[PDB]
Amino acid sequence: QNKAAVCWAKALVPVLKTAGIDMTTEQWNTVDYFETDKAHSAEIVLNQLCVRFFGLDLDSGLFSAPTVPLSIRNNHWDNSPSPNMYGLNKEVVRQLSRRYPQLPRAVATGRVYDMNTGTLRNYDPRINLVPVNRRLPHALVLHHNEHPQSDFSSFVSKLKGRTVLVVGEKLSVPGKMVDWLSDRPEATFRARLDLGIPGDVPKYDIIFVNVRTPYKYHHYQQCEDHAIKLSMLTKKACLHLNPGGTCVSIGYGYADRASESIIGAIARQFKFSRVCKPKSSLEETEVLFVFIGYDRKARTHNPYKLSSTLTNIYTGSRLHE
């Protein structure tokens, strides 16, 4: 799953309402993609709101009741019948009531359950920064700072390969044949990128996903908001690789369940996968996911290696590149 479509906020209203939640426009505006009017995954957005309101992600089972369907039709989210159904699971609420005494009241009144105090509050996306039920697969950054945009032209020019696709923001790459896929109207290939890589795009030896996600509240948030970009661009980019090709993507780890699953699904498809933070990468949370040797071999993926590298990067124990 994890497909992007339009009108996800509208489709989510009835799901959210099972937990007494009623999002105003200003509150919706704290969801990345809302203000910019871009397509998204309803599930990823639900997950984000589940954490923000109740301090728990979807793997808690909190919205596992098959109450309200979420379907995609004609690139639009809606509530037509589907095998993917969600809604407040009252049994889970009761299962959790011992540990979280006011949680039943939170989900009855659509207020935020402050996981630090146990008290209810008005919606604010800074109260519950991480899902307390999730074993985070790697360390997160404590200190994030304002850095100028990283330049990866040096990094990509040194990858093995002749034909290159840069997806997203413009990037000159000295020494190679570079095509540019973007929403900017002068790109080699032009389209909305929130709905994914257009199927008519050719095949390439290297694809570089040069797309970033704004840091607003926390490394976790940043990660979550980039997940849909991993799915719609990075993962879809694997269908546009020649045998043995390479996909490199800007990323922030996989603090959230979706990113972890998407990166896993991408890693399985390559001989080699690694995570890098070159000297040119200033933003503390930023990393490059590096997938080399695309092929059609069936594989498993142990996340220990990438996860350990991520932790070492974000805690500062890995040598500087």
Q: Tell which positions 64-93 bind Na ion, by CB under 5 A.
A: none
Please identify the residue of the shown chain whose CB is closest to the bound Na ion: 269
- List the catalytic residue out of 7, 144, 276, 301: 7
Instruction: Find the binding residues for Na ion in span 249-308 (CB under 5 A).
Output: 269, 296-297
> CB burial class (10 A; 0-12, 13-18, 19+) of residue 241?
buried
Among positions 178-197, residues that touch Na ion (CB under 5 A) are none
| Core vs surface per residue 252-283: b (16+ CB within 10 A) or e | bbbbbbbbbbbbbebbebbeebebebeeebeb
| Cα gap 109→107, rounded to integer Å | 6
Q: Give the nearest distance from C-beta 298 to Na ion in angstroms.
A: 7
Q: Are strands 204-210 and 163-168 parallel, antiparallel or unpaired?
A: parallel
Q: Is 246 near Na ion (CB under 5 A)? A: no
Q: Least CB distance from residue 242 to Na ion, whole Å?
A: 14
For Na ion, which is the closer residue by CB, 98 or 296? 296
Helix pair 42-54, 8-17: axis angle to 10 deg: 40
Position 181, amino acid: L
Tell me the closest approach of the beta carbon of residue 233 to Na ion, in angstroms. 19
By beta-carbon proximity to Na ion, the closer residue of 220 and 291 is: 291
- State which residue, 147 or 297, has the beta carbon closest to Na ion: 297
Decide if 147 is catalytic.
Answer: no
Q: Which of residues 210 and 269 has its CB atom nearest to Na ion in the complex?
A: 269
Q: How far is CA 284 from the centre of its chain?
A: 17
H or E stretch at 155: helix 153-157
Nearer to Na ion, 269 or 285 (CB): 269
Smallest gap from Cβ 239 to Na ion, in A, equals 12
Beta carbon of residue 235, minimum distance to Na ion (angstroms, whole number): 13
7 is known as an active-site residue = yes
8 Å CB contact between 222 and 285: yes
Q: Which residues bind Na ion (CB under 5 A)?
A: 269, 296-297
Provide the annotated active-site residues. 7, 76
